């Protein structure tokens, strides 16, 4: 496995969690216990909090306001599920404003997410701070989501799980979310999720890497799939 980390001069770590054991792979293992903004990985929590507190539904359509967004791809209507996969920040900023600065702070504290700090602006905190979370915190969190063990209603955790559904290989399923924290120095890269393996075993993962400005968008996922293949968690079909 070991070549395919530095072959690109990457400052990165890959974490796996099986519900008893934490495993660390990569060029820089100490990133695993290091705190970073969640960026768009926070969308997982955001949806959970919104659904649980009746501020949104899995079926509701978030319509485009007509004004151009960061990507032309985002210039359309989205469900929270669609917006999750496209990582459509404007939709989730809206969800967060429905939630509110007091409720969002209370809920994050309630579920112990990262350092539990959001500050004054409810639609910015995951994008620039002060909310921070380690990769180990991220894997445990999604693993808990996978098992329906988070402090949310079971139906809520299920609905979000479905939002995360990325690919099926045979009897195995991949659930994942991406993050790119551009508004921070240095930039940070996330690929987070779990695989529901055929044998019924769940393995949760997190990739956390330094982002050297504008490198390729697909890199985070490609590495994680490669590592997942190398680990025998999610073999290439």
Author numbering: 44 to 280
Quoted passage from the original study:
Structurally, β-lactamase has a loop-rich region that includes the highly conserved Ω-loop. The Ω-loop of the class D β-lactamases contains a pivotal Trp residue that contributes to ζ-carbamic acid formation on the Lys base catalyst residue.
The substrate-binding cleft between the two domains was a cavity in the loop-rich region that contained four loops: α3–α4 (97–122), Ω-loop (155–177), β6–β7 (225–230), and β8–α10 (254–260). Except for Ω-loop, the loops showed significantly different orientations from the previously reported structure and formed a narrower substrate-binding cleft. The cleft had an arch-like architecture formed by Phe113 and Phe114 of α3–α4, Met225 of β6–β7, and Ile260 of β8–α10, with the side chains of Phe113 and Met255 forming a roof over the cleft at a 4.2 Å distance. The Ω-loop was attached to a side end of the cleft through a short α-helix motif (Phe168–Trp169–Leu170–Lys171), and the indole ring of Trp169 in the Ω-loop was inserted into the active site. The side chain Νζ of Lys86 was carboxylated by NaHCO3 supplied during purification and crystallization. An oxygen atom of ζ-carbamic acid formed a bifurcated hydrogen bond with the nucleophile hydroxyl oxygen of Ser83 and the indole-NH nitrogen of Trp169 in the Ω-loop at distances of 2.6 Å and 2.9 Å, respectively. Thus, the hydrogen bond of the ζ-carbamic acid group and Trp169 formed a link between the active site and the Ω-loop. The loops α3–α4, β6–β7, and β8–α10 are flexible and mobile around the substrate-binding cleft as indicated by the up to 4-fold higher root-mean-square deviation (RMSD) compared with the overall average 0.49 Å RMSD.
